[PDB]
């Protein structure tokens, strides 16, 4: 299912599908990037006479350009001629005609609801998960199992914004009052439940601990349930977790963190500074497994006030036979 160039002279003309299959399957709307890392997906995809003639030559795969623009543009008049190099609407129509005549309370991970001929019913994959039908569903637009959004003026941090009850964050195409969408590129905004997405992390610092080896110290002060950073890593299986946990107890040092009933995060080979958070059962930070756009991310939040130079920790919540580190 490959083809030649369309930039190039080697331009064997082809069908609309035939000149999109690459982009058709190499792209993730969930991620907005071609070949995303945490978005593996390759299956059978769901959706996506009276006057004289113009004796003009349609060069290689200008056929393809016109052909794919055709279903898509619903027969524009001058647009298609602006886009294609220097063609003529009369030539366009005659060419169109040449072609026409040519014829348990665990958590599971999100997987968008897709329905050929039903609503997001009890048989819906998203409904059986006990998770909502997020915007990347192919559920109907009126899907009751989707999410409404929030109706708060400026802040959403309390129990007032409905996003917060079942733990989510202000998806900026449903939460338009809060301030989630605003500052599409800029960041100075009043909503304080949009922290992970924009990645408003704290200027952390690495230095040697006073408990177990290395440790991590915030530089500038914070206040309760303020955002520190995200617990980045490598999202992998549970069995993979087990294999690696064996040989890491052999190293005797663990960075593993649970995500859900099916997935696990390891910051061992790669992750961010905040993997160095030392252990304590007198912590001053804690962890929420927060849904963000269908992706279970992890947020590290100050459990109380903190000043310059302090150390951060958190309740790892484990048997901890090993060192606290």
């Amino acid at each position: 299912e490959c083809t030649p160039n369309i930039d190039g002279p080697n331009a064997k003309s082809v069908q609309r599908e035939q000149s999109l299959h690459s982009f058709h399957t190499l792209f993730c709307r969930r991620c907005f990037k071609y070949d995303c890392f945490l978005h593996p997906f390759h299956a059978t995809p769901n959706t996506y006479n009276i006057e004289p003639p113009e004796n003009v030559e349609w060069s290689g795969a200008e056929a393809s350009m016109f052909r794919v623009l055709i279903g898509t543009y619903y027969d524009n008049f001058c647009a298609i001629a602006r886009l294609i190099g220097t063609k003529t609407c009369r030539q366009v129509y005659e060419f169109r005609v040449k072609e026409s005549s040519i014829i348990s309370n665990h958590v599971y991970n999100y997987q968008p609801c897709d329905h050929p001929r039903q609503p997001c019913d009890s048989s819906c994959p998203c409904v059986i998960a006990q998770n909502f039908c997020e915007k990347f569903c192919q559920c109907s637009s009126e899907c009751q199992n989707r999410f409404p959004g929030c109706r708060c003026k400026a802040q959403c941090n309390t129990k007032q914004c409905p996003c917060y009850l079942a733990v989510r964050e202000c998806d900026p195409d449903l939460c338009l009052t809060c301030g989630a969408a605003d500052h599409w590129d800029s960041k100075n905004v009043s909503c304080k439940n949009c922290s992970i997405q924009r990645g408003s992390k704290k200027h952390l610092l690495l230095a040697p601990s006073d408990v177990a080896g290395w440790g991590i110290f915030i530089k500038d002060p914070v206040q309760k349930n303020e955002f520190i950073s995200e617990y980045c890593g490598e999202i992998i299986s549970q069995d993979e977790a087990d294999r690696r946990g064996k040989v890491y107890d052999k190293y005797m040092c663990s960075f593993l963190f649970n995500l859900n009933n099916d997935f696990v995060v390891d910051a061992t080979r790669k992750g961010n500074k905040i993997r160095f958070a030392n252990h304590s059962v007198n912590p001053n930070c804690y962890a929420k497994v927060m849904m963000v756009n269908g992706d279970h991310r992890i947020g590290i939040f100050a459990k109380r006030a903190i000043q310059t130079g302090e150390e951060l920790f958190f309740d790892y919540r484990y048997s901890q036979a090993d060192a606290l580190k």
């Binding site: 977790a241 064996k246 890491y248 593993l256 649970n258 696990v264 929420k288 901890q320 090993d322």
Partner: peptide, 7 residues
């Protein structure tokens, strides 16, 4: 399981 952290 090999020891993993919860929230």
């Amino acid at each position: 399981a090999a020891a993993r952290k919860f929230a």
